[PDB]
C-alpha cells in the first residue's frame, strides 16, 4: 500500500516539470508584437440572407466544400440541406431520432452525417441511385451521445461523444479504425485539419488536446482555459487554433508553440462562447456568444473589430466557407443568418 | 440563362415540394407535446409507459399526441446536453421517494432540481415532479434506522398542509412528511420568483394507476399558462 500517494507526488510534481518547460518558452507574446500591426478599424458584417426554413431551433451547421451549399440540422428531427445563392432547400431529410446535436458535409458531398443524443452516427448518401436521400450507413459504437463529427474523406471520419473518448471510424466495415481516449470529460467540439494529419478537440475537462489521426496517440495537451471548452477551430494553415469556452473568453493557442498565445475576454460579458470560426487570413476571429451578439475580434490586434446583431435567441453554431467567402450563423430562433 | 432559368424551374419544384412538406411538418410536430423524463435509476420510468429508440415514446391520449423521452442512455455529465431542451413542454423529474437512506440521495435530487431550476436556458421550462416509491417512502420512513430528521430536522416544526390526505392506517407524520418533501420543493419553487414555471407533485408506487390523467391535465394547464403569460394575464 501507500503506492498511490507517491504516484501522486511523482505525477503532479512531474507535471510541474512540464509546466517549467512550457513557461520557459515565453520569450515573446503575440500582443507585444501587435503594436506595430495596423488594426482592422471598425468593420462589421451585414445580413445578406435571412433564411426562414426551420420549425424548431437550429442547432448546428456546416459548409459544403463548394462554398455554395451549407447543411443545417434542426432540433425537430429534420435535416435540411440548404443553398446559399438560390435560398431554396437542396434536400430535406427526416431523421430517425428527433434530437440532432450536429451534422457535417462530406469533402466530396457524397455523404452527410448527423448525430445527437441518439448515440448513433447517421450517414446519409447524397448519391442514392434508387431514389432520394435515404439512410446510407449508421455507425453505432458509442457509449455516449453523439456530440460532433467532421469528415476526413468519404470513408473514414472522426466523431466525438460524451463517452469522454473520440473515435476514428470507417463506413464500409462499420467499425472504428482507431479509438482515442484520455480526456476527462465529454468531447464537445472538434475541428479537423486541412491536411488531416492531426486534430484538435475541446472537452469538458477544460483542456484542448491535439491528437494524431494515424498514430492513435495523444500528441499534446494544452490547458489555458478558465472553464469548459464549447467550440474549437484549427487555424487554416494547420499551425494554430482558436478556442471557444464557457470562460467567456476566446483564446488562441499554437500547436507548435505549445503554450497560450493569447486571451480574448471582456469585462461586460458573463456569457459563454457558443461557437468560433476563422477568417481567410486568420486575422479575424468570429465569436458567437449567448448574449445573441456575435463579436468579431481581430485575431492579431485582439480588439473587437465589430459585432453581429442578429438572432434574438442563443447562437448555436457558426461557420465560414472553406474559401472564407461567407459567414453563416445558426441560432435557436429557427432562422439562419448569413453575413459578410 | 438556360442554367439559371432551368434551375429556377427544377429547383423551384424542389422548393415547392420541400416547403409544402414543411408546412405539413410544423403542424404535426408542434401539435405534439415533448416531455423530458429523467431520474437517476430504478425510476419506474418504463413502468409508467409499459401498461424509434427505446427512449422515445409515441402515444395517443385524449386526442393529444405525446412524445416522452428517456435520457437513461447518457452519462451523468449533463450540463452540455441538457441545454438541448428549452422548448420541451416540460421537464419530468422522477425521484425515488424512499431514497433518504443510502446518504439521502434524495438530497441529491433536491440539488439537481435546483440545478435545472436555475439554468438560464431552462428558465421557461416547468418541472413536473414525480415522487416515486410512495409506499416505499412511508414504510422506509417508519423503519427509522437511517433518520431523515438528521437531514430534515425542520420536519418537527414544519406544519401540515390544510388538505391532509392520510392513507388508511397511516401515522400522520408519514403523510405530512410526504407533503413536507413536496413543500421542500416548494421553497425551491419560490427560489426563482419568476412565476414562469411551477412544480406539480405526483405519486407513484402507491398503486399502478396511470399518471396520464395527471401528466396530461397538468401539461395542458402549463402550456395554457405559456399562452396566458404571453397574453399578459399573469
Amino acid at each position: 500500500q501507500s503506492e498511490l500517494d507517491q504516484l501522486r507526488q511523482e505525477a503532479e510534481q512531474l507535471k510541474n516539470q512540464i509546466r517549467d518547460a512550457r513557461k520557459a518558452c515565453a520569450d515573446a507574446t503575440l500582443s507585444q508584437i501587435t503594436n506595430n500591426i495596423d488594426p482592422v478599424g471598425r468593420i462589421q458584417m451585414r445580413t445578406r440572407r435571412t433564411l426562414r426554413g426551420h420549425l424548431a431551433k437550429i442547432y448546428a451547421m456546416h459548409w459544403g466544400t463548394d462554398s455554395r451549399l451549407l447543411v443545417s440540422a434542426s432540433q425537430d428531427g429534420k435535416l435540411i440541406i440548404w443553398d446559399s445563392y438560390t435560398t431554396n432547400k437542396v434536400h430535406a431529410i427526416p431523421l430517425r431520432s428527433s434530437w440532432v446535436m450536429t451534422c457535417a458535409y462530406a469533402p466530396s458531398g457524397n455523404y452527410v452525417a448527423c448525430g445527437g443524443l441518439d448515440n448513433i452516427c447517421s450517414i446519409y448518401n447524397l448519391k442514392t441511385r434508387e431514389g432520394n436521400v435515404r439512410v446510407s450507413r449508421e455507425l453505432a459504437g458509442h457509449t455516449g451521445y453523439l456530440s460532433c463529427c467532421r469528415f476526413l474523406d468519404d470513408n473514414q471520419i472522426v466523431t466525438s461523444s460524451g463517452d469522454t473518448t473520440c473515435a476514428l471510424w470507417d463506413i464500409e466495415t462499420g467499425q472504428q479504425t482507431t479509438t482515442f481516449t484520455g480526456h476527462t470529460g465529454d468531447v464537445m467540439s472538434l475541428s479537423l485539419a486541412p491536411d488531416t494529419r492531426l486534430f484538435v478537440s475541446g472537452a469538458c475537462d477544460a483542456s484542448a488536446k491535439l491528437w494524431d489521426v494515424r498514430e492513435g496517440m495523444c500528441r499534446q495537451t494544452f490547458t489555458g482555459h478558465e472553464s469548459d471548452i464549447n467550440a474549437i477551430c484549427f487555424f487554416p494553415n494547420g499551425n494554430a487554433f482558436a478556442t471557444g469556452s464557457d470562460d467567456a473568453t476566446c483564446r488562441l493557442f499554437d500547436l507548435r508553440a505549445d503554450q497560450e498565445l493569447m486571451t480574448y475576454s471582456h469585462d461586460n460579458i458573463i456569457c459563454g462562447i457558443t461557437s468560433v470560426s476563422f477568417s481567410k487570413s486568420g486575422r479575424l476571429l468570429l465569436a458567437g456568444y449567448d448574449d445573441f451578439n456575435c463579436n468579431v475580434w481581430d485575431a492579431l490586434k485582439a480588439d473587437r473589430a465589430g459585432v453581429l446583431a442578429g438572432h434574438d435567441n442563443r447562437v448555436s453554431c457558426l461557420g465560414v466557407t472553406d474559401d472564407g467567402m461567407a459567414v453563416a450563423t445558426g441560432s435557436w430562433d429557427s432562422f439562419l443568418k448569413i453575413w459578410n | 440563362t438556360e442554367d439559371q432559368r432551368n434551375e429556377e424551374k427544377a429547383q423551384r419544384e424542389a422548393n415547392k415540394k420541400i416547403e409544402k412538406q414543411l408546412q405539413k411538418d410544423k403542424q404535426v410536430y408542434r401539435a405534439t407535446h415533448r416531455l423530458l423524463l429523467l431520474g437517476a435509476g430504478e425510476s419506474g420510468k418504463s413502468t409508467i409507459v409499459k401498461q424509434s429508440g427505446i427512449f422515445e415514446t409515441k402515444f395517443q391520449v385524449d386526442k393529444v399526441n405525446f412524445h416522452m423521452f428517456d435520457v437513461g442512455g447518457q452519462r451523468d455529465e449533463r450540463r452540455k446536453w441538457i441545454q438541448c431542451f428549452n422548448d420541451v413542454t416540460a421537464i419530468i423529474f422522477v425521484v425515488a421517494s424512499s431514497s433518504y437512506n443510502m446518504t439521502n440521495r434524495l438530497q441529491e435530487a433536491l440539488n439537481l432540481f435546483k440545478s435545472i431550476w436555475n439554468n438560464r436556458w431552462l428558465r421557461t421550462i416547468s418541472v413536473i415532479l414525480f415522487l416515486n416509491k410512495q409506499d416505499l417512502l412511508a414504510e422506509k420512513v417508519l423503519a427509522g434506522k437511517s433518520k431523515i430528521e438528521d437531514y430534515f430536522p425542520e420536519f418537527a416544526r414544519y406544519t401540515t398542509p390544510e388538505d391532509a390526505t392520510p392513507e388508511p392506517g397511516e401515522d400522520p407524520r408519514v403523510t405530512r412528511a410526504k407533503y413536507f418533501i413536496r413543500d421542500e420543493f416548494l421553497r425551491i419553487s419560490t427560489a426563482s420568483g419568476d412565476g414562469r414555471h411551477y412544480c406539480y407533485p405526483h405519486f407513484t408506487c402507491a398503486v399502478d394507476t396511470e399518471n396520464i390523467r395527471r401528466v396530461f391535465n397538468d401539461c395542458r394547464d402549463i402550456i395554457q399558462r405559456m399562452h396566458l403569460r404571453q397574453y399578459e394575464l399573469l
Partner: nanobody
Amino acid sequence: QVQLQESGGGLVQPGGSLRLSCAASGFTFSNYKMNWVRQAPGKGLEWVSDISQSGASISYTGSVKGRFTISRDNAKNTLYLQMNSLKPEDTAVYYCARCPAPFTRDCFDVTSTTYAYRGQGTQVTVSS
C-alpha cells in the same frame, strides 16, 4: 492547468472544529460558485455545501445546515470548511469542487465518477 489544493483532513475525535482550505488556480475563483462535496467510504457522491461568489447565497445538506461552516476567501482565492459537531457518520473523502459554469446559479457537480473541476481531495476521519 486547473487545480484545487485540498488541505486539512485526518483523524479527529468527534466534537472538534477545523478550518479546511482549498487552493484555487487556473481560473478566477471570484466568479465561480463554490462547494464542498463528499464521497463517503463506499458511497456515491453527495452534495454537501455550496456558497455564492459574494458568500451570501449559502446552502447546506440537512445535517450540516448551520452546524458546518463553508467560508470563501476570494482575495486569497481559497475555500474553507470549519467543522463543528463532528460525527463518525460524517467521515468521508472530501473534495472541494467549483461549479462549472461561470456567473450562474445552477451547478452540475456531484456528478459521479468524472467531474472536471476537483482537487485530489482529503480524507476526513472521525474516530469512535
